[PDB]
Specification:
Largest sheet: 11 strands, mixed, barrel
Keywords: fusion protein, transcription
CATH superfamily of the largest domain: Green fluorescent protein
Assembly: monomeric
CATH architecture of the largest domain: Beta Barrel
Name: yeast enhanced green fluorescent protein,Ubiquitin
Number of helices: 2
CATH topology of the largest domain: Green Fluorescent Protein
Entry title: Crystal structure of yeast enhanced green fluorescent protein-ubiquitin fusion protein
Strand content: over 45%
Order of helices and strands: EEEHEEEEEEEEEEHEEE
Helix content: under 10%
Number of strands: 16
PDB class: fluorescent protein, transcription
Structural class: mainly beta
Distance between the termini: 44 Å
Length: about 300
């Protein structure tokens, strides 16, 4: 989209959260930077009101999916950047199994050169002796797939995933996430086909920091839509077949796929595109061969 251009290079990020969990009020400020080319986010958060009353890992998902890396073949499915600069509202309900819930509302938008995430969080019905208010969660994080679908009647996306938080006893605390995002602006956005974000997070601490804090790193990559594409091949007798290939397929691997359909050994095949003989150790992309091009099989 047009919003994509705002993500070239490294973009500064500001995060602000006001929270109230079981009547315990708190605030957090964060700052860092995002590099969507690498799908990478680095953030540091400080609780400005004192001690955080919930475990830091429970707030990782709340604290900018516009920093995901969408592969080239999926760029038309990146809702998040397409909503910029005006941004989007991100709302969630997070159900902690056998415990309380968070409800969050956030605005993610550009303020000048800086991508800002401003959040209100309310938590209710937590057990005083449970994993959350009892601070029984390990300080670590797992990889999850974030499933995205368009809501084409409502101009946004619906998102769901299940977070697993590790506990020392070897149990896990599940946090079922339900999410919706809606653009703030009136211009059109990208309403995607179904896909997911493969999301990795690592939590660390700053030895010099005395305040209650979290350092967060995320790597986020879109997936779930095949990068394979069809090409056409004219066979020795002039019939047309299709192959399923990736741009990174070697000419050798293309010949292997032709053997599967036509029964001609690779070492007997010669492939021609636009009059040019194709050489085994090169790739389809090396030749700038696009989806639904035609190759010619000859002897």
């Amino acid at each position: 989209s047009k919003g994509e251009e705002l993500f070239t290079g490294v973009v500064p990020i500001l995060v602000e959260l006001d929270g109230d969990v079981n009547g315990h009020k708190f605030s957090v400020s964060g700052e860092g930077e995002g590099d969507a080319t690498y799908g990478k986010l680095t953030l540091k958060f400080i609780c400005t009101t004192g001690k955080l009353p919930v475990p830091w890992p429970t707030l990782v998902t709340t604290f900018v999916q516009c920093f995901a890396r969408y592969p080239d073949h999926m760029k038309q499915h990146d809702f998040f950047k397409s909503a910029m600069p005006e941004g989007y509202v991100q709302e969630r309900t997070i159900f902690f199994k056998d415990d309380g819930n968070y409800k969050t509302r956030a605005e993610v938008k550009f303020e000048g050169d800086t991508l800002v995430n401003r959040i209100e969080l309310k938590g209710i019905d937590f057990k005083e002796d449970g994993n959350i208010l009892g601070h029984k969660l390990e300080y670590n994080y797992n990889s999850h797939n974030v499933y995205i679908m368009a809501d084409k009647q409502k101009n946004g996306i619906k998102v769901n995933f299940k977070i697993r938080h590790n506990i020392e006893d070897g149990s896990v605390q599940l946090a079922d996430h339900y999410q919706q995002n809606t653009p703030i602006g009136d211009g059109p956005v990208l309403l995607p086909d179904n896909h997911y974000l493969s999301t990795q997070s690592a939590l660390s601490k700053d030895p010099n920091e005395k305040r209650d804090h979290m350092v967060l790193l995320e790597f986020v990559t879109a997936a779930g839509i095949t990068g394979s594409m069809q090409i056409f091949v004219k066979t020795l007798t002039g019939k047309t077949i299709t192959l399923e290939v990736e741009p990174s397929d070697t000419i050798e691997n293309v010949k292997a796929k032709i053997q599967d359909k036509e029964g001609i050994p690779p070492d007997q095949q010669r492939l021609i595109f636009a009059g040019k003989q194709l050489e085994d150790g090169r790739t389809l992309s090396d030749y700038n061969i696009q989806k639904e091009s035609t190759l010619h099989l000859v002897l």
